[PDB]
C-alpha cells in the first residue's frame, strides 16, 4: 500500500497534465491582471490575487507530504509571482508539507 | 574493496533487523525511565541516561563515515529524546561522521 517512486512519478504527470488544462482554460478567457497559473514540478499554482500571499493545500497526491498543511507563494501587485529576495527563483514555502524542513 | 550502494543497503538492513531485536529485548526487561532504543534509518541508539548527551561512534558499517567520530543525541530528564528547538524532529548531530557535514 506504500507508493513506489514510479507510481509517484505517474501521479505527478497526471497532475501536470491537468495543470496544462487549467493554464489553457485560463489563457482562453483572461480577465484583469492576476498571477497566472503555472506548474513548478509539484503542484499547479492557481490564479493569484495581486498583492496577496497565495496558499495551496499540500498536494494530496504526494505521499510524503503532510496533507493538512499549505504551501505558499507571493503574488505582487503587478500580477507576477515574487522572486526570492536576492535570488533568481520564484519564492515558495513548502516547510509545512515536509518534515525535513 | 570499495563497497557498492546495494551492499550498503544490505548492511543497513542487517543493522536494522539487529536493532529490532535489541528493542524487543528491552521491552521485555524494562527498568526506570531512560531513553529507549530507536532506529533512525542509520544506527540503533542505545538506552540513554536521562538528562545527558548520548554519544555513539559513527557506525563502522557505513563506508562513507569517519569511524573515529561520534553522533550525538539528547536525552531529557523525562526519558525522551529531545526534539530540535523549533521543529518536530528528534535532534541528532552527525557532523563528525560526514565530511559534507
Amino acid at each position: 500500500d506504500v507508493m513506489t517512486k514510479e507510481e509517484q512519478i505517474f501521479l505527478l504527470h497526471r497532475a501536470q497534465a491537468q495543470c496544462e488544462k487549467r493554464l489553457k482554460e485560463v489563457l482562453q478567457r483572461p480577465a484583469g491582471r492576476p498571477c497566472l497559473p503555472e506548474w513548478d514540478h509539484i503542484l499547479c499554482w492557481p490564479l493569484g490575487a495581486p498583492g496577496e500571499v497565495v496558499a495551496v493545500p499540500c498536494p494530496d497526491y504526494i505521499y510524503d507530504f503532510n496533507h493538512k498543511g499549505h504551501a505558499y507563494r507571493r503574488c505582487d501587485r503587478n500580477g507576477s509571482w515574487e522572486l526570492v529576495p536576492g535570488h533568481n527563483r520564484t519564492w515558495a514555502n513548502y516547510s509545512e508539507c515536509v518534515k525535513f524542513l | 574493496d570499495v563497497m557498492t550502494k546495494e551492499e550498503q543497503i544490505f548492511l543497513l538492513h542487517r543493522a536494522q533487523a539487529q536493532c529490532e531485536k535489541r528493542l524487543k529485548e528491552v521491552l521485555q526487561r524494562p527498568a526506570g525511565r531512560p531513553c529507549l532504543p530507536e532506529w533512525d534509518h542509520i544506527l540503533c541508539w542505545p538506552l540513554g541516561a536521562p538528562g545527558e548527551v548520548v554519544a555513539v561512534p559513527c557506525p563502522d558499517y557505513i563506508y562513507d563515515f569517519n569511524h573515529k567520530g561520534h553522533a550525538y543525541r539528547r536525552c531529557d530528564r523525562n526519558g525522551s529524546w529531545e526534539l530540535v528547538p523549533g521543529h518536530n524532529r528528534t535532534w541528532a548531530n552527525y557532523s563528525e561522521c560526514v565530511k559534507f557535514l
Binding site: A92, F100 | H41
Partner: peptide, 22 residues
C-alpha cells in the same frame, strides 16, 4: 528501501520546490 527511494525523490523535488530562505 522503496519507501526511501520515493522519499529521496521528496528531497530532490524540496530542492528543485522550497526556495524560501533556510
Amino acid at each position: 528501501y522503496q519507501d526511501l527511494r520515493r522519499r529521496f525523490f521528496x528531497h530532490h523535488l524540496x530542492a528543485e520546490x522550497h526556495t524560501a530562505e533556510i
